[PDB]
Amino acid sequence: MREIVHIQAGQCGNQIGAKFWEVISDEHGIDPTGSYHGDSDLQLERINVYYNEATGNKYVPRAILVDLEPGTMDSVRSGPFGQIFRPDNFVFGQSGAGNNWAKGHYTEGAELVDSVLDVVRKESESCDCLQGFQLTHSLGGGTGSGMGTLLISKIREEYPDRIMNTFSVMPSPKVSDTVVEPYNATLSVHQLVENTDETYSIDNEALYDICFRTLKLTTPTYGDLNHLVSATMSGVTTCLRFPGQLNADLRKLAVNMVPFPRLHFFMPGFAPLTSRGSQQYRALTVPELTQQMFDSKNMMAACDPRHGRYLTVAAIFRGRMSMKEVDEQMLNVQNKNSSYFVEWIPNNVKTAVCDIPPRGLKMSATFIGNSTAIQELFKRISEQFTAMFRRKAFLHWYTGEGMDEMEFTEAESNMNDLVSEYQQYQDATAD
Amino acid sequence: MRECISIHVGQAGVQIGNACWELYCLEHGIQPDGQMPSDDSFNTFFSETGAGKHVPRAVFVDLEPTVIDEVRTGTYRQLFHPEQLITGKEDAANNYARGHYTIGKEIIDLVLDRIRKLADQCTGLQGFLVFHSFGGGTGSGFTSLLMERLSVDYGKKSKLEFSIYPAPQVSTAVVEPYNSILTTHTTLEHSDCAFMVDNEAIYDICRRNLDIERPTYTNLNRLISQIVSSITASLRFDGALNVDLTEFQTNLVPYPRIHFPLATYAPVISAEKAYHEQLSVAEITNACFEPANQMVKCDPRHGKYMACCLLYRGDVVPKDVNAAIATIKTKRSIQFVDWCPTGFKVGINYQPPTVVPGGDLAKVQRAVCMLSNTTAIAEAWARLDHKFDLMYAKRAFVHWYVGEGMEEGEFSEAREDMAALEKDYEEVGV
Amino acid sequence: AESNIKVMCRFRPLNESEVNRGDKYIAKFQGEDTVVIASKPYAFDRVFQSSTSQEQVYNDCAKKIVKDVLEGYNGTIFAYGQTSSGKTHTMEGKLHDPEGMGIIPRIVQDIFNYIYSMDENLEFHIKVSYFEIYLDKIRDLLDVSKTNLSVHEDKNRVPYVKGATERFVSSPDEVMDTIDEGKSNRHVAVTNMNEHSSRSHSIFLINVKQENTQTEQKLSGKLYLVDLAGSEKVSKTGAEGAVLDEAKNINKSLSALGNVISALAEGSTYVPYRDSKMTRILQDSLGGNCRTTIVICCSPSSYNESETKSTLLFGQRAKTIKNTVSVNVE
Ligand SMILES: Nc1nc2c(ncn2[C@@H]2O[C@H](COP(=O)(O)OP(=O)(O)OP(=O)(O)O)[C@@H](O)[C@H]2O)c(=O)[nH]1
Ligand SMILES: Nc1ncnc2c1ncn2[C@@H]1O[C@H](COP(=O)(O)OP(=O)(O)OP(=O)(O)O)[C@@H](O)[C@H]1O
Ligand SMILES: Nc1nc2c(ncn2[C@@H]2O[C@H](COP(=O)(O)OP(=O)(O)O)[C@@H](O)[C@H]2O)c(=O)[nH]1
Ligand SMILES: [Mg+2]
């Protein structure tokens, strides 16, 4: 299907989202004045998938940007591609919810929610063959978390037929200055499991370790990290943006990824990220790519799948190459590393190849895994959540912003049913 | 007179189409716009139009626009007439119930009308060649819906399939054991005779018989198209008999449920292997009983031959054919049907095959394709039902199909007939 | 402590569309326990052959569950089976005819007939709600305003429906009015299988509370009476457009009910009550503190043989299930 509507929410969600758009906009050959410079004819091909044809020779992204704190929209607006976003589509408040999911979901954000809905209806009814909606938000802040999930549910009540794609970023156990993040997380997961088609779980923890070990960088600076996010986020959108081989859309992705409809939390990964400029050595070819793509060291969630099995892998290759060598390299890997897949799911590895690569490279490979090990993440949030909840610590800051305690009980109740679910299909066998 | 229409459903389906149509174009002498320096047996699969443009007896169908927009962007875009190129928008997306229920019915009338306006320009229409996967969204779902509606619409007029089969090494989708069993279940009663294409076999033959190290699906379709051109050669060249699709049905079926033959094609030799380049009619007839060159990569060392037709094209003499067939009947440990005598139907067309200008095969003086009904493909069904059972046991992925219009009973019913297809393949033999 | 799910089997007659097609009568019966279909026996709690009246279904199926629910157990009665097979006839029926009325208003009366037969020291507070699951959202039936309702978890986390019309009823006659109102608000369409086809799963809940003033003890019981929709083959019903959207959600929710039934019978480690809103509202009903009777509803026409067979195997599966039954305090 054709048009995706993209929605960015919270400080992160709008910064990783602008970094996404400058990546796909360079791929589709469009500049910060909104001019199509594309040197290949194929750059304009499926342009209307992400883009709106505006008045005249201007292509504008079908992106809606939401925040309560208006300085986020200013850093986007004063960012390098600022003018490419339509200033109707800057949706801004004047406060900020303040790492409080409740002030997101019930206070400030439920005041803002309807201003947003009016602009996603407007992107929507303007689309010819609408695919569905793509939200980028946090599972840990204040804007992205409660106001995101308010969004997920509100648009989905309006459009339950089309696809709900989300890039949901997960908070780190190592860093963050914000203590209450597992509270915001548990509360979000509860809404997410009920209202998304697919959830890419984007762990800050892993992005940190991917950037610190692989690429090289020491303290966490979000502009360097957001490059690895944006490169992943280009990677999986490839098949929607550009033609090649199998799995064009998100539905044929999600249909092939999800065995049981609440298990839609996917583990991202990206290849090549080797020693820049110099290597030029070490790795180059499609099996070397397939290797890096399959590696626990190249995974973007902090759950080591060497400790919890894979259900399904969707692998998006980019460049001109051999469909046979992927068929064999996906055969090989699944034969040999069989004990890290699940026996009851036959044919575990799903492959797309697009002729177009990204810029900076000639060949690339993106991993998307529906892994049972994503439970270690739901356990980390829980064990932390239930820690604070049993002493009813910080609770008053949230219950005071509208919530019942029984909403903390219910949000926990589904996260732990989600845990039993993920623990089952780790443990399960054939017959 | 004796005209046939190719209906190309699915991305694979469509890209074997491309290669087939491009190959018929070169075969006939047809320039890539339409004009041709000559005339002759373009008759069946092409129609000459007023302005000298020779138009395919085609229908191309895709459930999004992308596969078909590459057609009308590239080469032969001016050969392919816009009415015969049919796009969708919101696809089935690997999901059989979207292709049968939800999205499929949204193009079905429209595909049938452009089929009917092409068929009503067929003086002696034989029937259809539908090319589709047993495994995809488009290919699996839209084709089974299309088969039911064509059995009501054209009835007596034949439906041949060229059907893409997944394999126990080379596979594609997770839900593909459902796609397969679901589609077959529907096709069984409706279809006529189906030439299973195993994508592993083609991949494997290209590696071992064609010495290709890096093949792409372009390379694979080049071998595929060469078996489809070999079958269709009987309508399109000069020669002896077998000029009709129904002789294929008639002579290949042991019982009509068991309507799925195996095709061999020979020689599958690379242009680069020009040392032992002088192959005989015997040589290429040996290769047709060789387990290498089987388009369906199952074990003929377990499975019995039930029925064989040999189609020779190029510099082949039928003295040479007789001699070949007698000695292949003495040499190979081939089990055969009891109720009938010895089973070979032989076709001889005088004109060699064609390669594409970059084509991988050698430009051989003679060629053969064997169409053969084997019990070997019950081995392949058995692997497929055992995968259905795995997934169905846990109920995995089934919410996406039942949640897009399907009943779970349909899975039970489908599997029950596939398990009776298993018993039909057991019972021919005892 | 552990009581099986009673799985009870009802065959209707051959309807007009069936007899005018010329369809065979495929049901053979062996005693009260077993139905034989294509020589194959399918074994149950009680089987009801075609001639069974609406009263007959009431005294054998329904009757005893009335005394148990008012002993402060929860009680679930629900009908399952493909389209036209006689679920709505069974549960609703023809409400105002004293022969044609079904389980729901017959349950209501025998509740109040029990309350008429009780001492002056038992106070009873009965509240009812009536809602439907239509296009996977919970529409309130007694109120037009609420188009989706919410699933909340209770005191010991057992789920219940928040945001509903809880009408507090005095007479059974007034309960017949909330039934009559809610029935006619319930979303019904003409299909080629049924002219009054249920397109939604309809959820009547009677929550009955009682205290004896003199004993000073309080008990509650949730009585759920679900007329389900019947998972249908698109070939048969001829469903396109909205009829299909409807069908999708129904097939979707009853595959999930099936999988929950299935998981319980095999002893699978999760038990996904969390798939559908129907499976959630049925959490107590399928493994919890309720005495649950499943009425599997069947057609005897040859046309539906395959899908009839499946409905019987759902019930053989289902009979194997026990509930974790207990007395519900207040
Ligand atoms: N032989 C052949 N197979 C191909 C071709 N390109 C892709 N395939 C494969 O054939 C199978 C795909 O079948 P399709 O019929 O394309 O599946 P489809 O119906 O397009 O699937 P959807 O996109 O879900 O609708 C997969 O195993 C592909 O790898 C091709 O040109 N020739
Ligand atoms: N046991 C029966 N005895 C006599 N008539 C019956 C019986 N069961 C059903 N019928 C007839 O069939 C008709 C339709 O039955 P009903 O609506 O209950 O089917 P249903 O199973 O609810 O269908 P759906 O799944 O579409 O809702 C009834 O209105 C009634 O007249
Ligand atoms: N990758 C990444 N994560 C960030 C960034 N900024 C903050 N984070 C973290 O990711 C989540 C962002 O939440 P957000 O919704 O942006 O917080 P809010 O805008 O302040 O409500 C939090 O858990 C932050 O610690 C960023 O630019 N990139
Ligand atoms: Mg009904």
In a domain, C330, yes or no: no
Contacts with C264 (C-beta within 8 Å, 6 or more apart), sequence order: C271, C286, C287, C320, C321
Whole-number Cα distances in Å, C265 to C69, C167, C262, C269, C322: 24, 36, 5, 11, 9
CA of residue C107 to ligand 4 center, whole Å: 18
The answer to whether the beta carbons of residues A260 and B396 sit under 8 Å apart is: yes
Does the N-terminal peptide bond of residue A272 adopt cis geometry, omega within 30 degrees of 0? yes
Counted residue by residue, chain A has a size of 431
**A225 is written with which tokens?**
């990290």
Q: What DSSP string describes C118-186?
A: S-TTEEEEEEEEEEEEETTEEEESS-SS-SS-EEEE-TTS-EEEES---EE-SSHHHHHHHHHHHHHHS
Unique residue bearing structure tokens 């409660």: A146
Range C152-159 contact pairs with CB under 8 angstroms and sequence separation of 24 or more: C152/A406, C152/A410, C153/A406, C153/A409, C153/A410, C153/A413, C157/A409, C157/A413, C158/C283, C158/C284, C158/C288, C158/C289, C159/C280, C159/C281, C159/C283, C159/C284
**B184 is written with which tokens?**
């077959």
Q: Do domains A1-259 and A374-431 have the same CATH topology?
A: no
For residues C200 and C228, what is the distance between their CA atoms, to the nearest angstrom? Answer: 7
For residues B328 and B320, what is the distance between their CA atoms, to the nearest angstrom? Answer: 12
Pocket of ligand 2 (CB under 6 A): C 12-13, 15, 83-89, 194, 196-198, 229-230, 297
Residue B194's DSSP bridge partners are B161
For helices B176-190 and B143-153, angle between their N-to-C axes, nearest 10 degrees: 10
Phi-psi region of C108 (alpha: psi -120 to 50; beta: other; left: phi over 0): alpha
The answer to whether the beta carbons of residues C205 and C313 sit under 8 Å apart is: no
**B99 is written with which tokens?**
């292709």
Nearest Cα of chain C lies from the Cα of A292 at a distance, in angstroms, of 35
Domains of chain B in sequence order? 1-261 (3.40.50.1440), 262-376 (3.30.1330.20), 377-430 (1.10.287.600)
Whole-number Cα distances in Å, A169 to A144, A149, B3: 9, 12, 59
Identify the CA nearest to B311 among candidates B374, B246, B266, B357.
B266
Unique residue bearing structure tokens 């759920």: C224
Identify the CA nearest to B74 among candidates B63, B64, B85, B83.
B85
Half-sphere exposure of B346 (CA within 13 A, CB side): 15
**Contacting residues of A for B64, CB less than 8 Å apart:** 1, 248-249
Q: Where are the beta strands (DSSP E) in C38-141?
A: 40-43, 46-48, 74-80, 122-134, 137-140
For residues A416 and A410, what is the distance between their CA atoms, to the nearest angstrom? Answer: 10
Which of 148-207 (A) contact C at CB < 8 A?
A: 157, 160
Nearest Cα of chain C lies from the Cα of A159 at a distance, in angstroms, of 12
Domain range for C161: 3-323
The answer to whether the beta carbons of residues B295 and B398 sit under 8 Å apart is: no
Residue C127's DSSP bridge partners are C168, C207
- The conformation of residue C303, written as its DSSP 8-state character, comes to G
Q: What DSSP string describes A105-127?
A: HTSHHHHHHHHHHHHHHHHHTT-
Q: Test B399 with C248 for CB contact under 8 angstroms.
A: no
In a domain, C329, yes or no: no
C148–A contact, CB cutoff 8 A = yes
For residues B315 and B351, what is the distance between their CA atoms, to the nearest angstrom? Answer: 7
Q: Test C310 with B408 for CB contact under 8 angstroms.
A: yes
Whole-number Cα distances in Å, C2 to C67, C247, C272, C325: 18, 35, 21, 6
Assign residue C18 the CATH number of its domain: 3.40.850.10
CATH tag, A260-373: 3.30.1330.20
Q: What DSSP string describes A320-378?
A: S--HHHHHHHHHHHHHHTGGGB-TTS-S-EEEEEES---TT-S-EEEEEEEEGGGHHHH
Over the range B196-209, which residues count as b (16 or more CB within 10 Å of their CB) and which as e? bbbbbbbbbbbeeb
Residue A6's DSSP bridge partners are A63, A134
What are the percentages of helix, strand and coil residues in chain B, rounded to 5? 45, 20, 40
Residue C311 CB coordination number (10 Å):
23
| Residue B104 counted as an annotated binding residue | no
Give the pairing type, strands C290-298 and C6-11: parallel
For residues B399 and C249, what is the distance between their CA atoms, to the nearest angstrom? Answer: 10
For residues A253 and B423, what is the distance between their CA atoms, to the nearest angstrom? Answer: 36
Query: Phi/psi of residue C222, each to 5°?
Result: -85, 115
| Residue B136 counted as an annotated binding residue | yes
The answer to whether the beta carbons of residues A26 and A84 sit under 8 Å apart is: no
Give the pairing type, strands C201-212 and C218-227: antiparallel
Q: Test B66 with A248 for CB contact under 8 angstroms.
A: yes
Q: What is the dihedral of CA C309, C311, C313, C314, to 10 degrees?
A: 170
Q: Test C251 with B413 for CB contact under 8 angstroms.
A: no
Residue A349's DSSP bridge partners are A313
* Residue of chain C minimizing CA distance to B405: C248
Identify the CA nearest to B104 among candidates B143, B132, B65.
B143
The answer to whether the beta carbons of residues A53 and A62 sit under 8 Å apart is: no
For residues A261 and A121, what is the distance between their CA atoms, to the nearest angstrom? Answer: 27
Nearest Cβ partner for A421 among C136, C152, C270: C270
The answer to whether the beta carbons of residues C67 and C114 sit under 8 Å apart is: yes
Over the range B288-317, which residues count as b (16 or more CB within 10 Å of their CB) and which as e? bbeeebbbbbbebeebbbbbbbbbbbbebe
Give the pairing type, strands B366-374 and B305-314: antiparallel
Whole-number Cα distances in Å, C27 to B250, B258, C87, C315: 41, 33, 18, 16
Minimum CA distance residue for ligand 1 atom 29: B172
Minimum CA distance residue for ligand 3 atom 13: A141
Minimum CA distance residue for ligand 2 atom 1: C12
- The conformation of residue A131, written as its DSSP 8-state character, comes to E
For residues B247 and B257, what is the distance between their CA atoms, to the nearest angstrom? Answer: 17
Identify the CA nearest to C263 among candidates A403, B393, A137.
B393
DSSP H or E run through B370: strand B366-374
Identify the CA nearest to A66 among candidates A145, A130, A122, A3.
A145
Q: Is B404 helix (H, G, I), strand (E, B) or coil?
A: coil
The answer to whether the beta carbons of residues C87 and C230 sit under 8 Å apart is: yes
- The conformation of residue C81, written as its DSSP 8-state character, comes to -
- The conformation of residue C25, written as its DSSP 8-state character, comes to B
| Residue B95 counted as an annotated binding residue | no
Residue C240's DSSP bridge partners are none
DSSP H or E run through B67: helix B66-73
Whole-number Cα distances in Å, A272 to A17, A275, A279, A295, B152: 22, 9, 10, 11, 54
Minimum CA distance residue for ligand 2 atom 2: C12
Contacts with B323 (C-beta within 8 Å, 6 or more apart), sequence order: B281, B282
Please calculate the CA angle A233-A73-A20 and round it to the nearest 5 degrees.
15
Nearest Cα of chain C lies from the Cα of B398 at a distance, in angstroms, of 9
Whole-number Cα distances in Å, B361 to A206, B43, B296, B317, B350: 49, 27, 19, 22, 19
Whole-number Cα distances in Å, B344 to A9, B324, B347: 70, 11, 10
C17–B contact, CB cutoff 8 A = no
Q: What DSSP string describes A373-403?
A: GGHHHHHHHHHHHHHHHTTT-SHHHHHTTT-
Is B247 a residue of the active site?
A: yes
In a domain, C65, yes or no: yes
The answer to whether the beta carbons of residues A69 and A95 sit under 8 Å apart is: yes
Over the range A74-92, which residues count as b (16 or more CB within 10 Å of their CB) and which as e? eebbebebbebbbeebbbb
The answer to whether the beta carbons of residues A167 and A9 sit under 8 Å apart is: no
For residues A316 and A363, what is the distance between their CA atoms, to the nearest angstrom? Answer: 11
- The conformation of residue A85, written as its DSSP 8-state character, comes to S
Query: Phi/psi of residue A53, each to 5°?
Result: -75, 105
Does the N-terminal peptide bond of residue A280 adopt cis geometry, omega within 30 degrees of 0? yes
For residues A283 and A295, what is the distance between their CA atoms, to the nearest angstrom? Answer: 13
Of 3.40.50.1440, 3.30.450.40, 3.40.50.2000, 3.30.540.10, the CATH number of A1-259 is: 3.40.50.1440
Unique residue bearing structure tokens 């006529």: B192
Pocket of ligand 1 (CB under 6 A): A 246, 252, 323; B 10-13, 15-16, 63, 91-94, 133, 135-139, 164, 172, 199, 217, 220-221, 224
Query: Phi/psi of residue C256, each to 5°?
Result: -60, -40
Residue boundaries of the structural domains of chain A: 1-259, 260-373, 374-431
The answer to whether the beta carbons of residues B59 and B118 sit under 8 Å apart is: yes
* Residue of chain A minimizing CA distance to C135: A160
- The conformation of residue C58, written as its DSSP 8-state character, comes to I
Rg of the Cα trace of chain A? Answer: 21
- List the single best residue of A344, A406, A407 to mutate versus C (max C Cβ within 10 A): A406
* Residue of chain A minimizing CA distance to C137: A157
For residues C12 and C297, what is the distance between their CA atoms, to the nearest angstrom? Answer: 8
Q: How many domains does chain C have?
A: 1
Chain center to CA of A37: 28
Give the pairing type, strands A198-203 and C34-37: unpaired
Q: Test C310 with B409 for CB contact under 8 angstroms.
A: yes
Deposited resolution, Å: 5.0
Q: Test C153 with A409 for CB contact under 8 angstroms.
A: yes
For residues C197 and C83, what is the distance between their CA atoms, to the nearest angstrom? Answer: 7
**Contacting residues of C for B404, CB less than 8 Å apart:** 248
Within A247-340, residue ranges assigned H as helices are: 251-257, 286-293, 323-336
Chain center to CA of B342: 26
DSSP H or E run through A138: strand A130-138
Residue C11 CB coordination number (10 Å):
24
Identify the CA nearest to A234 among candidates A320, A330, A128, A354.
A354
Q: What one-letter code names the amino acid at A259?
A: P
* Residue of chain B minimizing CA distance to C231: B407
Over the range B31-53, which residues count as b (16 or more CB within 10 Å of their CB) and which as e? beebebeeeeebbbbbbeeeeeb
Q: Test C270 with A417 for CB contact under 8 angstroms.
A: yes
Residue B345's DSSP bridge partners are B309
Q: Is B126 helix (H, G, I), strand (E, B) or coil?
A: strand
The answer to whether the beta carbons of residues B131 and B161 sit under 8 Å apart is: yes
Identify the CA nearest to C179 among candidates C290, C75, C102, C256.
C102
| Residue B392 counted as an annotated binding residue | no
CA of residue C153 to ligand 4 center, whole Å: 29
Counted residue by residue, chain C has a size of 330
What are the percentages of helix, strand and coil residues in chain C, rounded to 5? 35, 30, 40
Identify the CA nearest to A60 among candidates A92, A87, A91.
A87
Q: Test B405 with C247 for CB contact under 8 angstroms.
A: yes
Half-sphere exposure of C108 (CA within 13 A, CB side): 28
Residue C205 CB coordination number (10 Å):
20
Query: Phi/psi of residue B56, each to 5°?
Result: -50, 140
**Contacting residues of C for B402, CB less than 8 Å apart:** 231, 251-252, 255
Q: What one-letter code names the amino acid at C231?
A: S
Q: Where are the beta strands (DSSP E) in B108-190?
A: 125-133, 158-165
Pocket of ligand 3 (CB under 6 A): A 10-13, 15-16, 97, 99, 138, 140-145, 169, 171, 176, 178, 181, 204, 207, 222, 225-226, 229
**Contacting residues of B for C231, CB less than 8 Å apart:** 402, 407-409
DSSP H or E run through B306: strand B305-314
The answer to whether the beta carbons of residues C281 and C151 sit under 8 Å apart is: yes
The answer to whether the beta carbons of residues B116 and B161 sit under 8 Å apart is: no
Would you give the end-to-end CA distance of chain B in angstroms?
Answer: 42
Identify the CA nearest to A137 among candidates A67, A88, A207.
A67
Identify the CA nearest to C303 among candidates C8, C10, C88, C15.
C15
Ligand nearest to the CA of C89: 2
User: Which of these is catalytic: B70, B200, B247, B283?
Assistant: B247
Whole-number Cα distances in Å, A154 to A146, A195, C277: 12, 9, 18
**A196: buried, middle or exposed (CB in 10 Å: 19+, 13-18, 0-12)?**
buried
Q: Is B176 helix (H, G, I), strand (E, B) or coil?
A: helix
The answer to whether the beta carbons of residues B195 and B231 sit under 8 Å apart is: yes
Range C258-264 contact pairs with CB under 8 angstroms and sequence separation of 24 or more: C258/B408, C258/C314, C259/B395, C260/C286, C261/C286, C261/C314, C261/C317, C261/C318, C261/C321, C262/B395, C262/C317, C264/C320, C264/C321
* Residue of chain B minimizing CA distance to A161: B404
- The conformation of residue B100, written as its DSSP 8-state character, comes to I
CATH fourth-level superfamily of A374-431: Helix hairpin bin (1.10.287.600)
The answer to whether the beta carbons of residues C239 and C251 sit under 8 Å apart is: no
For helices B66-73 and B11-28, angle between their N-to-C axes, nearest 10 degrees: 20
**Contacting residues of A for C269, CB less than 8 Å apart:** 420, 423-424, 427-428
- Name all chains with 3 or more CB-CB pairs below 8 Å to chain A: B, C
For residues C51 and A29, what is the distance between their CA atoms, to the nearest angstrom? Answer: 74
Unique residue bearing structure tokens 């809606």: A64
Phi-psi region of A61 (alpha: psi -120 to 50; beta: other; left: phi over 0): beta
Ligand nearest to the CA of C250: 2
Within A181-304, residue ranges assigned H as helices are: 181-195, 204-209, 222-241, 251-257, 286-293
Interface of B with C (CB under 8 A): 100-102, 105, 395, 398-399, 402-410, 412-413
HEC string for A3-53: EEEEEEECHHHHHHHHHHHHHHHHHCCECCCCEECCCCHHHHCCHHHCEEE
Longest Cα separation, chain C: 63
Q: Which atom of ligand 3 is nearest to the CA of A181?
A: 23
**Contacting residues of A for C157, CB less than 8 Å apart:** 409, 413
Edge-to-edge strand order for the sheet containing A364-371? A90-92, A63-67, A3-9, A130-138, A163-170, A198-203, A265-271, A364-371, A310-318, A349-354
The answer to whether the beta carbons of residues B424 and B257 sit under 8 Å apart is: yes
Q: Test A430 with B176 for CB contact under 8 angstroms.
A: no
Identify the CA nearest to C101 among candidates C10, C176, C195, C13.
C176
